[PDB]
Design a protein around this motif. Structure first.
Motif, PDB file in Angstrom:
ATOM      1  N   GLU A 164       0.784  -1.273   0.000  1.00 55.42           N
ATOM      2  CA  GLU A 164       0.000   0.000   0.000  1.00 55.42           C
ATOM      3  C   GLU A 164       0.811   1.316   0.000  1.00 55.42           C
ATOM      4  O   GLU A 164       0.373   2.347  -0.538  1.00 55.42           O
ATOM      5  N   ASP A 165       1.993   1.278   0.606  1.00 49.53           N
ATOM      6  CA  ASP A 165       2.972   2.370   0.460  1.00 49.53           C
ATOM      7  C   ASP A 165       3.253   2.524  -1.076  1.00 49.53           C
ATOM      8  O   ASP A 165       3.171   3.605  -1.636  1.00 49.53           O
ATOM      9  N   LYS A 200       0.201   3.905  -3.147  1.00 46.00           N
ATOM     10  CA  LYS A 200       0.134   5.335  -3.015  1.00 46.00           C
ATOM     11  C   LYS A 200       0.920   6.084  -4.113  1.00 46.00           C
ATOM     12  O   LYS A 200       0.405   7.038  -4.754  1.00 46.00           O
ATOM     13  N   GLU A 229      -0.527   8.047  -7.447  1.00 44.41           N
ATOM     14  CA  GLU A 229      -0.225   9.446  -7.659  1.00 44.41           C
ATOM     15  C   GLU A 229       0.503   9.677  -9.007  1.00 44.41           C
ATOM     16  O   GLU A 229       0.309  10.690  -9.699  1.00 44.41           O
TER      17      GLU A 229
END
Lengths: 7, 230, 230, 7
Positions: free
Chosen positions: C74-75, C78, C82
């Motif tokens: 999930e890091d 992100k 983006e």
């Protein structure tokens, strides 16, 4: 046209 | 943050958005710490793609310019030369950008033989790319700065790296190109390339598991140049 | 001036600097006159390279995103999302740019059957590229605008161009892709592509000296899609 | 992955 170090 | 930037550099590289890969790796360089091998390589690929795009454009436009000079279309010449100059401006800005990162951040923080040779050789490469299109004083200054950096890298490489090491070979290959293409010295280019190749052949037991494919490829390029040049 | 801009577009195309090719051809479009076949083609290549770079980036980043969703990092997610969004912003701006040039300049000044079909099909293509990454309302509006433009191009093409004409075939190929990839309609995509291909086979005597290689290539693509889709 | 008109 000489070859240099590729990347 | 440093790991995040690396990750963003790697995404940009996959997406072939080399400008962004440069911006990410420039931020890593700006942390004033020794880069890992991976980070060094990411940074060098990023800029070699960014500059290599403009060098390939420059060479196409210059050849177009050479064709047109042979047919004397002067209206065309005007636009081709203005277009070349613009690409030259970009090449200058890009070389100046990495040369500042090298001088500010990379070289001061470098504390291993390998990284020092890599960054000095890089400095030699970026002055050399300045020299490719430079005329007059600019060409002399770029050639002198390139020579100094490649001698500095050579001094460290001769004392600190085995002759088969891929950075030492890569340095020999590019410094030989420098003697050939910038100093117009086929004899010195041939000696340097031949010496580097013979010294590695003499010490093939120093070939590393990590980089024997990299060494072999550079040694083949040293040979391909010697072919091209004799 | 118009000839100079064409020349600059052609230099930029040789140098693979497609942004500049776009700026040059956008100035031609802005003259509010019928473009020649060459100018139409230069303009369309310019933008297809500019947008095609970001579509290829988008698809790489989206696949990376899909891999990561499968491993739940999930890091990473992100940053990938983006990064995707940023590329989407660029795709939107680029599509909006040509869609404005089409609406302001190209379509109003177009006065031949061929140019009208080419520009409406282009409008259909650029909405369709909006639709590829759009979700929700944006996707519906892009799909509707694309459909309208491709129907408008089809209406003119059916009355004004032979079934072997490369723009009419090119329109059939892209409108079939639209039905397939945007409307999720493999049956309608297959019918349109098959109809276009059969109608050209029926009238192969209408094949033009100027574009029989272009027609043959599109007909092979219509066939390759039908293969892919059945 | 469908083919569209090339350029």
């Amino acid at each position: 046209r000489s070859f240099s170090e590729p990347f | 943050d440093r790991e995040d930037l690396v990750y963003q550099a790697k995404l940009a590289e996959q997406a072939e958005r080399y400008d962004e890969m440069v911006e990410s790796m420039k931020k890593v360089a700006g942390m004033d710490v020794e880069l890992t091998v991976e980070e060094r390589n990411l940074l060098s690929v990023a800029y070699k793609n960014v500059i290599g795009a403009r060098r390939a454009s420059w060479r196409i436009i210059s050849s177009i310019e050479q064709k047109e000079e042979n047919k004397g279309g002067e209206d065309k010449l005007k636009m081709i030369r203005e277009y070349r100059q613009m690409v030259e401006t970009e090449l200058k800005l890009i070389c100046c950008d990495i040369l500042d990162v090298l001088d500010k951040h990379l070289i001061p923080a470098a504390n291993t033989g390998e990284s020092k040779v890599f960054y000095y050789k890089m400095k030699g490469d970026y002055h050399r790319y300045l020299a490719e299109f430079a005329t007059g004083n600019d060409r002399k200054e770029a050639a002198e700065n390139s020579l100094v950096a490649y001698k500095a890298a050579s001094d460290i490489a001769m004392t600190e790296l085995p002759p088969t090491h891929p950075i030492r070979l890569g340095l020999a290959l590019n410094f030989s190109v420098f003697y050939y293409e910038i100093l117009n010295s086929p004899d010195r280019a041939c000696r340097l390339a031949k010496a580097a190749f013979d010294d590695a052949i003499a010490e093939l037991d120093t070939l590393s598991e990590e980089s024997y494919k990299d060494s072999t490829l550079i040694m083949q390029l040293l040979r391909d140049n010697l072919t091209l040049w004799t």
